[PDB]
Design a protein around this nucleic acid. Structure first.
Ligand SMILES: [K+]
Ligand SMILES: [K+]
Ligand SMILES: [Mg+2]
Ligand SMILES: [Mg+2]
Ligand SMILES: [Mn+2]
Lengths: 95, 59, 83, 75, 369, 79, 79, 67
RNA sequence: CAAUUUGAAACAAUACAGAGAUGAUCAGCGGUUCCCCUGCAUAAGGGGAACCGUUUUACAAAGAGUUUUU
C-alpha cells in the first residue's frame, strides 16, 4: 500500500504516537506491517510521563487500530513525493 | 498457536466472556477458523467476533 | 513487518482497548494479535494461568473508543458560537 | 446491480445521507463509489432531521467515509 | 517434431496480399472465419500504404485449405492473393537487449521490408532468452533481410539473421554445460588453484577441453576456491565425479556437474519467495503485473530512463513470472521503500504497473483469478 | 477525478478541514491519504471541543507533520 | 431459505430492523449480495424499547433509498 | 459448518444480535451463511414486540441456543 | 531436524531456435477438490485454478526455539 511505504521510509526516525486512548509515546520506529502496527524501540512518554504503567518498557508493539495520530517533523518528509504518490495510488483507489 | 490450541483442546472446560460482559461457562465441541465456539453445559454457538477473552483450564 | 516474535515467553505489559492492563507471558500469537498468554494478572492479582485474549481487544503490547454524549449538541454549540 | 444502478441514477440529484452516528447530510451528490464513499456539493449538516439545529453549512464538496454511511436516499 | 510442428505452421498459416486499405483485422476475420476457426489474424499496411497484407493462422489445416480457395477472389475492387506462408520466416538473435517488437519492426521498415508478425519467446524458464521469428511477405524479402541484417552491428550487438530452420541450429558457446560436460570443483585451497595441477589431477578421467578459473580468488587469499573444468565428452565428466569427497593435496574437494544459469536463478527466487527473513527482503520490491515476455534488461532501462535510478543502486533483477511480476533488489531498505513509493502506478510499456512487497504481488495475482 | 476519493486528490496541497471522532477538528495542508481515509496533514492545527460543566472549551494543538488514522475521520471538506 | 423469502418480498412492504433501535418500513425495491436494500417511500422510525406507543417517527422519506446492509438485523415481510 | 442448525429446524431457538437485541422464535429454516427464517418471532430490546415471520441476517448473529 | 548468516569464489563471449521454453526451474507417479467452455439443467468431452501422498538435496562453519479503518 501507501502509508506502509511511507512509514518504512521513516524507520529509524524518532516519532511521537498519540493513541485513541490519549496516551502519547515518543520513541524510535523499528518496524511496521501491512496493518500499520508499529514497533517502537526505546520509548518514552511525553509531558505527562505520569503513567508508571509505561516508560520502563524497553520496546512496545502498537496495534495499528489503536493509533490516533503519528506526529512527525517536516524535515522527515518529501511532500512532493508524498503528494505524487497519493495521486498515483488514487488512480488505484477503488481498492 | 491460539486457534490450534482451541481445536486440539476439543473437550476442555472453558470460561468465555462475551463483549456485552455476559459470561458463559462450559465444555467445547468445535472451533472454527474464525474462532466460532460450539459448547454445551452452559450458564450454544458463539460467533467468534463476539468473544472478549477466554479463561482456560489445564496447563 | 512488526511481529511479536521477540516478545515470546517473556513477561509483558498489555494495554487493552477498554484501558485495562494485564501482565503476562505470551506463548503464542496469530496474525490477528490473539494473545495466548499465561500467568496473567492486573497491573494486581492473577486472574488465570492460561488464557486466550482476543486481538480485537489488544491495544498495545481511558479506552480506545471516543463515544460521547452525542457530540451533536457540542457541534451546534460550536456552530452558533461562530455565528 | 440494482443497488449500483440506483447509485448510478442518483449521481447529481439532491439527497440525504445519514451516517451511523445519526448525523445527516443534505446536498447534491457529486460522487459515490462501490464502498459508498460520498462527495456532496452544497451540503448541510443536521443531527437526524433537517428540521433540527444546523451543525454546519459547507461551501465546497464534503467527503464522507463509506464505512460510516447508513443510508442514502433521494430528497 | 522439428519437422512436424514446422510443417504444421507452414501448413496452417496463410498470407493474404492486396486487401483494401479499409480492411482491418475485424473485416479479415469476418471474410475468412467461414473457412474454419481462426487462431490469429495480423494485418499490416503495404510499404506505400496502397493495400494491406494479412497473416491468418488457422486452427486446423482444413482452415488453410478452405482459405486458399479464396485466392484471386475480389474484395472491394482488390484482386487478392492467398497462399501458404512458406520460406518467408526469419530467425533473428543477438539484437540489443532492449530491442522490442516495435524496434525490430523499425529495422525492417528501414530496409523497406513489411513485417507481418514478430514473435518473441517466453522468459518463464530462462530469463536471458533473446531471439525472434519474423514472418515477412516474400521469400525474396526474407533473403533480402538476411543479406542486409546478417552481420549488422547495431548499438554494439552484431545481429544474427537466418532464414528460419530449426534443423540448422548452432551449438551454443555455453553448450558444454548444457551437455553435461562441465564439472565444478569446489573447496580447493589457493595452493591448489592452478590449471596445470588440475589438468594433471583430472585428465585421467578423459580428455580435458578447457579449464576456467574465476579470477580474483588467489589475489584475495580466499579460504575456499572453485574452478570449472570442461571435458571433451560427457562420460569423462561423469567419471570425474569420483573425485567428490576425495583428497587433492590436503583439501577434500567437492565435484559436481555445473548448474545452468536458469536453474540457479530460479532456485534463488524460490529462496526469496519462501523467505521469512528480513535483511534481504527489506531491500527488495516487486513490480507487477508484467508480461512474461519482458526481460530484466528491459525493466532496468525502464528504471534508469523513466524513473532516473542510478545503475549502481540496483543490486539484482529477477523474474517471478508465476505471479506475473519481477523482483528488484536494491542496496538498502530505505531506498527500496522510497522506490516502492515512487514506482507504484508508474507507466511501463504503455500500461500502468504496481509496486509492492512479495505478498502484494501474490495477492494481486490471486485477486485477478 | 471520478470516485469521491479521486476528487479528494484534487484537494492535495490545498487547505482542508477534517471532522474527527471525539468532538475534534483539524485544519492543514493535505499531503496524503488512502482509501481508509488515513491522512497525512502538514502545518496542522487540531481543535478539541470540550464540556466544562455548562460547556464551551476550545483547546488547540499545532504540528508540523501529522499522520491521522482514517478510522477516526468522520468528514473532510475545506476551511 | 432466507434469500428466497427476501426475493419473494420484492414489490411488497417490508420492515427493516437495524442493530440499533431503528427501523425503516417501506416498499422493497431490491437488494444485492451483501443485502444492501433498495426501499421505496420509506418511513424511518426510532423505537423506544419499553413502549411501542412512545416510538418516534424520525422522517418520512419519498423516493428510493439505499440502506446499507451493514446494520440490517431483521427483515419482516409486510411491516 | 460448525453448528448444524438442522437439529433446531422445528424447535424454538434464542438468538442474540450484535446491537444488544435479543430475539426468540421457532426456527423454520436457514442457509449455509446462517441467515435464518424464524416464525412467531418476538423481539426484545435493551420490552417485547411481536413480529411474526422474519428473516435474520447471519452477519449480525452473535449467539444461538435452544429456547 | 529445520531456518538464517557465513567459508564463497557461478567461470566459461551477452545473445545462439516460438507455450516448439523447464532440472520438483514450474516434475513424475497415485489420489482429492474447485472454476470455465460446449452439451438436453442428459450424458460424455475438453481447458484454466488450488490441495494431499510420495519420488529429490556437494561440503563445512556458526547459530538456532467475522477482530486491524470505531
Ligand atoms: K527482449
Ligand atoms: K507433487
Ligand atoms: Mg558468496
Ligand atoms: Mg452435469
Ligand atoms: Mn557469463
Amino acid at each position: 500500500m501507501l502509508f506502509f511505504s511511507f512509514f518504512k521510509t521513516l524507520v529509524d526516525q524518532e516519532v511521537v504516537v498519540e493513541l485513541k486512548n490519549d496516551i502519547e509515546i515518543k520513541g524510535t520506529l523499528q518496524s511496521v506491517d501491512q496493518f500499520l502496527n508499529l514497533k517502537l524501540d526505546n520509548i518514552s512518554c511525553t509531558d505527562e510521563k505520569k503513567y508508571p504503567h509505561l516508560g520502563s518498557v524497553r520496546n512496545i508493539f502498537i496495534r495499528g487500530s489503536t493509533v490516533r495520530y503519528v506526529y512527525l517533523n517536516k524535515n522527515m518528509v518529501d511532500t512532493n513525493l508524498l503528494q505524487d504518490a497519493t495521486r498515483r495510488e488514487v488512480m488505484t483507489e477503488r481498492k | 498457536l491460539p486457534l490450534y490450541l482451541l481445536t486440539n483442546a476439543k473437550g476442555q472446560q472453558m470460561q468465555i466472556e462475551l463483549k456485552n460482559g455476559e459470561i458463559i461457562q462450559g465444555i467445547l465441541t468445535n472451533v472454527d477458523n474464525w474462532m466460532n465456539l460450539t459448547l454445551s453445559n452452559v450458564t450454544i454457538y458463539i460467533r467468534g467476533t463476539f468473544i472478549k477473552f477466554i479463561k482456560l483450564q489445564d496447563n | 513487518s512488526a511481529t511479536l516474535k521477540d516478545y515470546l515467553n517473556k513477561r509483558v505489559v498489555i494495554i487493552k482497548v477498554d484501558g485495562e492492563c494485564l501482565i503476562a507471558s505470551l506463548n503464542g500469537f496469530d496474525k490477528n494479535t490473539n494473545l495466548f498468554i499465561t500467568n496473567v494478572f492486573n497491573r494486581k492479582e492473577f486472574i488465570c494461568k492460561a488464557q486466550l485474549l482476543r486481538g480485537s481487544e489488544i491495544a498495545l503490547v481511558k479506552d480506545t473508543k471516543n463515544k460521547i454524549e452525542n457530540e451533536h449538541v457540542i457541534w451546534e454549540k460550536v456552530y452558533e458560537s461562530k455565528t | 446491480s440494482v443497488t449500483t444502478e440506483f447509485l448510478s441514477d442518483i449521481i447529481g440529484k439532491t439527497v440525504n445521507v445519514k451516517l451511523a452516528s445519526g448525523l445527516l447530510y443534505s446536498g447534491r451528490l457529486e460522487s459515490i463509489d462501490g464502498f459508498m464513499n460520498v462527495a456532496l456539493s452544497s451540503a448541510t449538516e443536521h443531527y437526524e432531521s433537517n428540521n433540527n439545529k444546523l451543525l454546519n453549512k459547507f461551501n465546497s464538496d464534503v467527503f464522507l467515509r463509506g464505512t460510516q454511511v447508513m443510508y442514502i436516499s433521494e430528497q | 517434431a522439428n519437422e512436424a510442428l514446422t510443417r504444421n505452421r507452414e501448413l496452417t498459416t496463410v498470407l493474404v496480399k492486396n486487401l483494401p486499405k479499409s480492411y482491418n483485422q475485424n473485416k479479415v476475420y469476418k471474410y475468412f472465419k467461414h473457412c474454419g476457426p481462426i487462431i490469429h489474424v495480423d494485418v499490416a499496411d503495404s510499404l506505400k500504404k496502397n493495400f494491406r497484407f494479412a497473416r491468418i493462422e488457422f486452427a486446423r489445416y482444413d482452415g488453410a485449405l478452405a482459405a486458399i480457395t479464396k485466392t484471386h477472389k475480389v474484395v472491394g475492387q482488390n484482386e487478392i492473393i492467398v497462399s501458404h506462408l512458406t520460406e518467408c520466416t526469419l530467425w533473428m538473435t543477438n539484437f540489443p537487449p532492449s530491442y522490442t517488437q516495435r524496434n525490430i519492426r523499425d529495422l525492417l521498415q528501414d530496409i523497406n521490408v513489411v513485417a507481418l508478425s514478430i514473435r518473441l519467446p517466453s522468459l518463464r524458464f530462462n530469463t536471458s532468452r533473446r531471439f525472434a521469428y519474423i514472418d515477412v511477405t516474400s521469400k525474396e524479402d526474407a533473403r533480402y533481410c538476411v543479406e542486409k541484417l546478417n552481420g549488422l552491428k547495431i548499438e554494439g550487438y552484431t545481429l544474427v539473421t537466418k532464414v528460419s530452420n530449426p534443423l540448422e541450429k548452432s551449438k551454443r558457446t555455453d553448450s558444454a554445460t548444457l551437455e553435461g560436460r562441465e564439472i565444478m570443483i569446489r573447496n580447493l585451497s589457493t595452493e591448489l588453484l592452478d590449471e596445470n595441477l588440475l589438468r594433471e589431477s583430472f585428465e585421467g578421467f578423459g580428455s580435458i577441453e578447457k579449464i576456467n578459473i574465476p579470477a580474483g580468488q588467489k589475489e584475495h587469499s580466499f579460504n575456499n576456491c572453485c574452478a570449472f573444468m570442461v571435458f571433451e565428452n560427457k562420460d569423462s565428466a561423469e567419471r570425474a565425479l569420483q573425485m567428490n569427497r576425495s583428497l587433492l593435496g590436503n583439501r577434500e574437494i567437492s565435484v559436481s556437474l555445473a548448474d545452468k544459469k536458469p536453474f540457479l536463478e530460479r532456485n534463488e527466487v524460490k529462496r526469496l519467495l519462501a523467505s521469512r527473513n528480513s535483511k534481504e527482503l527489506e531491500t527488495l520490491i516487486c513490480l507487477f503485473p508484467l508480461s512474461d515476455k519482458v526481460s530484466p534488461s528491459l525493466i532496468c532501462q525502464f528504471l534508469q530512463e523513466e524513473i532516473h535510478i542510478n545503475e549502481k543502486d540496483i543490486r539484482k533483477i529477477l523474474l517471478v513470472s508465476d505471479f506475473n511480476g519481477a523482483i528488484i533488489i536494491f542496496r538498502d531498505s530505505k531506498f527500496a521503500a522510497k522506490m516502492l513509493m515512487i514506482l507504484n502506478g508508474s507507466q511501463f510499456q504503455g500500461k500502468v504497473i504496481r509496486s509492492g512487497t512479495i505478498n502484494d504481488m501474490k495477492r494481486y495475482y490471486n485477486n485477478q483469478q | 477525478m471520478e470516485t469521491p476519493l479521486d476528487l479528494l486528490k484534487l484537494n492535495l496541497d490545498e487547505r482542508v478541514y477534517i471532522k474527527l471522532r471525539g468532538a475534534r477538528t483539524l485544519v492543514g495542508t493535505l499531503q496524503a491519504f488512502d482509501s481508509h481515509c488515513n491522512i497525512v496533514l502538514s502545518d496542522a492545527v487540531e481543535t478539541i471541543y470540550q464540556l466544562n460543566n455548562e460547556e464551551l472549551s476550545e483547546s488547540e494543538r499545532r504540528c508540523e507533520m501529522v499522520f491521522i488514522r482514517g478510522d477516526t475521520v468522520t468528514l473532510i471538506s475545506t476551511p | 431459505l432466507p434469500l428466497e423469502v427476501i426475493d419473494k418480498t420484492i414489490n411488497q412492504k417490508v420492515l427493516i430492523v437495524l442493530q440499533s433501535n431503528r427501523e425503516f418500513e417501506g416498499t422493497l425495491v431490491g437488494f444485492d449480495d451483501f443485502v444492501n436494500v433498495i426501499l421505496e417511500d420509506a418511513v424511518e422510525w426510532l423505537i423506544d424499547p419499553e413502549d411501542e406507543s412512545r416510538n418516534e417517527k424520525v422522517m418520512q422519506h419519498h423516493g428510493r433509498m439505499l440502506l446499507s446492509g451493514n446494520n440490517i438485523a431483521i427483515l419482516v415481510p409486510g411491516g | 459448518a460448525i453448528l448444524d442448525l438442522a437439529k433446531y429446524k422445528d424447535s424454538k431457538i434464542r438468538v442474540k444480535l450484535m446491537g444488544g437485541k435479543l430475539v426468540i422464535g421457532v426456527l423454520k429454516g436457514y442457509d449455509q451463511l446462517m441467515n435464518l427464517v424464524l416464525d412467531d418471532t418476538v423481539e426484545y430490546m435493551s420490552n417485547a414486540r411481536k413480529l411474526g415471520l422474519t428473516v435474520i441476517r447471519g452477519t449480525i448473529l452473535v449467539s444461538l441456543s435452544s429456547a
